[PDB]
Design a protein around this ligand. Structure first.
Ligand code: FMN
Ligand code: FMN
Ligand code: FMN
Ligand code: FMN
Ligand code: FMN
Ligand code: FMN
Ligand code: FMN
Ligand code: FMN
Ligand code: FMN
Ligand code: ARG
Lengths: 175, 175, 175, 175, 175, 175, 175, 175, 175
């Protein structure tokens, strides 16, 4: 039943954005998700280049407001469309904006507009992860109902074990 | 005495920015305000275009620091000039920045520098308004002394009943 | 049957272009028109900004020839699509071009290509409206079959009583 | 009493635009006009360069709408300000636009907004002056109340005897 | 004697502009014209591209005033040079400008300066050709001495029978 | 039955690119082909301009990878879409790239990805056509299964008799 | 041992950024620091100009991510390099971002990556310093272990007594 | 001794360029190579973005000639430095250029300048791999001494079994 | 008779382009050639700068197609004008393009259009000269009738003994 679940996938400016192809193959070839739309922060776009993400996912990523066509607006259209929202990788920056309701780009505004199970997979090095401000944001996001997948230590952070959390959200959404 | 009250009017990137000419007619033709200066966020400017706002309000809206002339700085000059400060429409983004003392553009820096009665009229859809982070920001601004005019649901949010709140601030300033 | 009438709406560089969202809500929420496509002159676009018009009307306004996609050309495609053509607001400039068959932008070329009931609602101040050249253009357009909605003088012109003229055209087209 | 007459001076893209400094000295040093504001067409600006006109006349010529600051608009502000309007040199192009109420730049829109004695001094070669279309425009402008100063043939047209026509208009305005 | 006739050829932004090479081959290889200079409107240049026209006709087409080198000006130089003037294809826009003596680009200014037999071959669809304003312009041009070659209906207009009209003008010029 | 054949049409930077509208009129108005998509080399686009080709073929020509939308990449998507591939006119440059499996722009990459009847119609002058390297490429392309329409000598080459070759390919595809 | 302490120096967009050369002279000529690297916010760079700071500090200030060379990333590299981190002057804006773990430019990302004694010297006028949001941010940073040097009000704030706090930080780092 | 082998790594504009981070981790963390420098084609750079490649490999990739500093030139310096040269992924385009000695960018010029064991790993879809010209290029490169790792068919080609070929080349170079 | 031989001289992006002034003086002051026109590749222009070649040879080099004026095209005009064609210095890249009939810039297209004795003087280092692909291109060009002047090893290649080969070509052309 996962084939009709609409997965919205946000990508932030982290080293781990290089994992996007591998994660996309897992989502499509192992989990069986069919409808995936991506939103890139401006920093993610500058590091990875948005054109290859488009070719490998089948949709141009949304980065600028101008990418939404017609009535309404990118964050409302994407927020209403999403059955599951995954932010992977998330930056420490994203955690702060999401925890405090900041909405100064397409991704963080879409967070305010989405009403669906949401998984956030932050990545950063150990010094950043240990800062009290970062941990306050992690705690705040959990109290607001977001599923946080803590990073691992791949020596330089790396993605945590997100597969189970994402599958849980997809199954909850399918139900 | 309402003709000498100096009204600073901030405009954020909301659907409801199209209401600015209408609100301006109400401010001038019904309330009797004469001296009105506007500050637009970059997003408001990108959606609405500043040249028509200039034509109907009599002053070019300030968006970049470059729009302030001479000594000081835009936020200090506008902040000291204001007898009443109105943010209409305010974005969810604005609420987050004002609640936490962020000052990363002219408008939010002017908020820190202004010392006058302030009315904030946020606009956003129902999904965004219901987010815990947004409501924390609303509550925090009320605790800090800001007057919040809650949005309506105009089917896609719409401006609340701001006329009474703004009139009260203009009259309190006249005294 | 008014929901199937295809309304083409031209917008010129007048002060009254700020009224476009209000007129759009009236057309949709009261008259019941569903398919509305807009053409903005370069001057209208420079004053009002097309991105907010796009967001509230559901279609990007056409200004440059490049905005039409595929075969043909913007004026032929838009002219053939239209069941009713409304120019609101119209400039004095527009009256001169339409009256003499000038076609030096998309809007005035579409006028030549459209074969449907057309309502023109010019706006300008009293000095401009009284010019002999302007009145010759008004007279000539009426002789050519165009419905002219004369402006009011709301102190600086304002839109006349167009609702009856537009309703008539939508109803005549529905038949 | 001619020193308080406000002279609005339009300049078109003619060979005879080189006479603007000489005419400016005559207007100020011989006729005694004190308040002179210039409007240049885009073509006039491209041939003559706008910065020197500013340095020798004391005011930046208006060419783009952006040159008007504050409320309203260039054509209304200049049109209401003018006590006498002089177009010198005028192009054949200008005659056509003025004769038909075309208002597609600041100059020709200001013509529609001005309500004062107006002198037009066209310049062009003999082949152009003799065209039936040009003479229809000359006749139409005279019937509309404009004073036309016909060119001479200085071998390639040259300015006619405009001094008497301008002086008459300034005197009519003073009364 | 047709080899010494100087043919000035204006090209407007019509679907039929693709015929310029074919007409050029006919003029050179069948009629025997040797000296052919082209003027393109800005819209014609935007559609057809002047570099290919230059390569097949032997002269760079003139579009901007800057394309004329040395003393004088493009419209005077080209107008005095022409023994025959052909506008092919002509737009509805051109008919309006030529009929009313508008001279707001090189081509329409050259029309005012040329004193030679002139052939105009307009192209437009049936709806545009049927407009009263267009037919007024056609009638006015015929009264002023211009030869109009009415279009065909090639299904989207197509060029009329210009071969006879142009040959006649070229032979008339040779005499 | 030829109306559903998907024709992919490459255009190279040759003098004979001016023939594209004529060939298109024959393909659409006589043969009945309905879906025609073009790929222009950078040189073809710079000489001919893509805007008119778009207007008469119904699709914007593709030159840059970004001109193609969505997943798969331009050469794979266009190569798979094509039922017939026609290169007309082809440059000597193209023959060389096609003969050697060079794929350094969209067109030559699309050649590698296309699996359909293909007609190549080179045009060049006699000196270029006689070069040994050029004739090696022609021979090599014939051995690889491509249908070559050799140019004629039309004073400077001209297109050969391509209609029969193209008709044959369109019929093979429908079969 | 103070000559080997690696001092990372962040500069925000405050009036007091003009004091950077004087503070640099004290750090080098009186305290004895040798290796000083600066990070400027975009607003600081726009105010002070990074070329003179480079000339007097010996290193180009880092503002954009592109300034870091090789592996890793500016914030990790600068954050790991720093033995002491000084923000002087800090804006109210900086206080908000640092207090909430926002990392939306190089400077604030480096704060999260740094693991060293940090001194923050905010500057702002009296109205801004008295805002509740600003004072919450000051308190939060103190609880997080940051040393805050409160501003003075030299009539428009001015730097507080940072010499004691910075010398303390530099000396502890040498130990 | 594999840690001192200098590996030069060329990257072409293929879908499989997203595997560059994964392949880099294997080269560093499993094979133990320490000095790896990359050269990207313009198309590879446009797809993947060189900034993330720089951050994860420790060296900015070379794409433009300007990236070489000092005497000589990029292709000579990189070609002499290389102990093993790996092109992964290689495009069909690369195969053609390398097979025919074309050197029209940094990568293909470096191939001519390198004198070391070279492994080429082409990727392309099944239609492209089966083209006769492509297979001629594969055969020619093998005859010239290049190691070709044929692609796989991962349904859109995928990298072949390069691990064995690269390990062999690195080990032979260490010996 | 060598003073009337028209020498066309192509310059590629090699280190040895610094020899162009020396070769030009030898050609003019010692051999006596009077009519010399140069063609530079984009790479030659980017390395050497085109302005000084113009100053020292008396002609601006042709690099872009836009440099040819009037009918035809740069490669046809230059190819027909040439009595002798010299490529000095030639790159390895040039050898490949000439050997395979590639014509993707003005120079390599002029090679296809030229019908005259041609001397090619390649320069490259020893590693590049020894590549099988390069020697295949040398061999193919000799079989096609081109005179190849092999480089020397100036320790980094240097021009071979071209004087005899060029003199032979110029003298044969005079006959
Ligand atoms: C190459 C590179 C890798 C980065 N990786 C991370 C990361 O893994 N986690 C993180 O919090 N920030 C990382 N950053 C810093 C962020 O990109 C920076 O905070 C940025 O402002 C975040 O923008 P965004 O959250 O809007 O995408 C990295 C920066 C660079 C240049
Ligand atoms: C057409 C359009 C309409 C929008 N309307 C709203 C809105 O009504 N309320 C809101 O919170 N955000 C709205 N947004 C999203 C904001 O523009 C976005 O959060 C932006 O970052 C806010 O910028 P600002 O607060 O600096 O003006 C809209 C966006 C677009 C493109
Ligand atoms: C702020 C502003 C408001 C204007 N309002 C009007 C108007 O109401 N009526 C009018 O005829 N011209 C008005 N103009 C002048 C026109 O914009 C000008 O004539 C322009 O050339 C018309 O362009 P268009 O008809 O192609 O839109 C206004 C100009 C400005 C700058
Ligand atoms: C150097 C030069 C001199 C010109 N002189 C005249 C002139 O004297 N009279 C005229 O009608 N046009 C003249 N023209 C042509 C006009 O500039 C042209 O018609 C233009 O479109 C008029 O623009 P404007 O009326 O908006 O200023 C001249 C053009 C050039 C390049
Ligand atoms: C592809 C295309 C074809 C057009 N064909 C015609 C035409 O055949 N006749 C016409 O009157 N207008 C046609 N138009 C509209 C004109 O180009 C438009 O009126 C333009 O402003 C005329 O410019 P010009 O008269 O200065 O060339 C066409 C537009 C496009 C985009
Ligand atoms: C006006 C013009 C016409 C040309 N005609 C031809 C031609 O007919 N045949 C040819 O092989 N090259 C011709 N060329 C040269 C090509 O444009 C040149 O070789 C170019 O590099 C080919 O680019 P493309 O194959 O990617 O389209 C012409 C060049 C110009 C400027
Ligand atoms: C000339 C000038 C001086 C300023 N001085 C201060 C200041 O002293 N303190 C402050 O909090 N903001 C000051 N501001 C406002 C900040 O520049 C503004 O908040 C900005 O967005 C901060 O950017 P940053 O924190 O990234 O450096 C000043 C602005 C200007 C134009
Ligand atoms: C998204 C995308 C993926 C591509 N993947 C391949 C590929 O895997 N193999 C291939 O031969 N060409 C592929 N191409 C086409 C090449 O990019 C094209 O041939 C290009 O000119 C090669 O450039 P290069 O060899 O200089 O890197 C792809 C193109 C795009 C836009
Ligand atoms: C400074 C410099 C010197 C070069 N010298 C040579 C050379 O002597 N021989 C060669 O084959 N390539 C040389 N190259 C590489 C060529 O410039 C490269 O192959 C280029 O793509 C050739 O372009 P062209 O043949 O169109 O001129 C050099 C490159 C640079 C940056
Ligand atoms: N000669 C060809 N390749 N023909 C195309 C084969 C497919 C066939 N036209 C079906 O239908």
């Amino acid at each position: 039943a996962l084939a009709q679940v609409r997965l919205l996938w946000g990508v932030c400016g982290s080293f781990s954005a290089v994992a996007v192809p591998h994660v996309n193959a897992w989502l499509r070839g192992t989990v069986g998700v069919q409808e995936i739309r991506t939103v890139m922060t401006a920093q993610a776009r500058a590091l990875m280049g948005p054109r290859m993400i488009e070719a490998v996912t089948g949709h141009a990523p949304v980065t600028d407001w101008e990418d939404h066509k017609g009535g309404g607006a990118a964050h409302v259209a994407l927020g209403a469309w999403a059955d599951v929202l995954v932010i992977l990788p998330a930056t420490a920056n994203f955690l702060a904006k999401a925890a405090h309701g900041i909405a100064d780009d397409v991704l963080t505004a879409t967070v305010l507009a989405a009403e669906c199970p949401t998984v956030i997979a932050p990545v950063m090095n150990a010094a950043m992860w240990s800062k009290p401000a970062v941990q306050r944001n992690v705690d705040q996001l959990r109290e607001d109902g977001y599923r946080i997948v803590e990073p691992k230590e791949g020596i330089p952070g790396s993605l945590g074990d997100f597969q189970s959390a994402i599958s849980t959200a997809l199954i909850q959404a399918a139900a």
